[PDB]
């Protein structure tokens, strides 16, 4: 399940950076950015392989990728934030 909806502006500022890189189709800081998210545990709605893709949300001071990510869904304006390494998600609302 998805925890609820969150405004982009209520997320860490790095989330805004990640969405900007997704809109420009990169370049991305990490090689894992853009990989398919399998959603193996069906925390997100179950969809065909390739529906979802994952991108790092940089954590200030973290040596490498930390635990914050954006998952895109294929539908327009469909994006999810996790701060806990895919355990929980909120729908991102870029309008606020």
Q: What is the resolution of this structure in A?
A: 1.3
The dotted CATH code for 1-96 is 3.10.450.30
Name the catalytic one among 14, 41, 53, 85.
85
Report, in angstroms and rounded to the nearest whole number, the Rg of the chain calculated over CA atoms. 12
Is 53 a known active-site residue?
Answer: no
The technique by which this structure was obtained is X-ray
Q: Are 83 and 33 in contact (CB under 8 A)?
A: no
d(C-alpha 8, C-alpha 16), whole Å: 7
Q: Are 52 and 6 in contact (CB under 8 A)?
A: no
Residue owning tokens 């539908």: 75
**Residue boundaries of the structural domains of the chain:** 1-96
Q: Which residues pair with 54 in a beta bridge?
A: 71
Tokens of 35: 């990989």
Is 54 a known active-site residue?
Answer: yes
Residue 55 sits at the vertex; the CA angle it makes with 49 and 57, to the nearest 5 degrees, is 150
d(C-alpha 63, C-alpha 52), whole Å: 26
d(C-alpha 56, C-alpha 76), whole Å: 20
Name the catalytic one among 14, 53, 54, 78.
54
d(C-alpha 32, C-alpha 55), whole Å: 7
């Amino acid at each position: 399940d998805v925890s609820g909806t969150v405004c982009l502006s209520a997320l860490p500022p790095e989330a805004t950076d990640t969405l900007n890189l997704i809109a420009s189709d990169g370049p991305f800081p990490y090689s894992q950015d853009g990989v398919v998210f399998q959603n193996r545990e069906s925390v997100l709605p179950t969809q065909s392989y390739g529906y979802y893709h994952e991108y790092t949300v940089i954590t200030p001071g973290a040596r490498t990728r930390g635990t914050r990510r954006i998952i895109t869904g294929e539908a327009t304006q469909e994006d999810y934030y996790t701060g806990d390494h895919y355990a929980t998600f909120s729908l991102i609302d870029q309008a606020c």
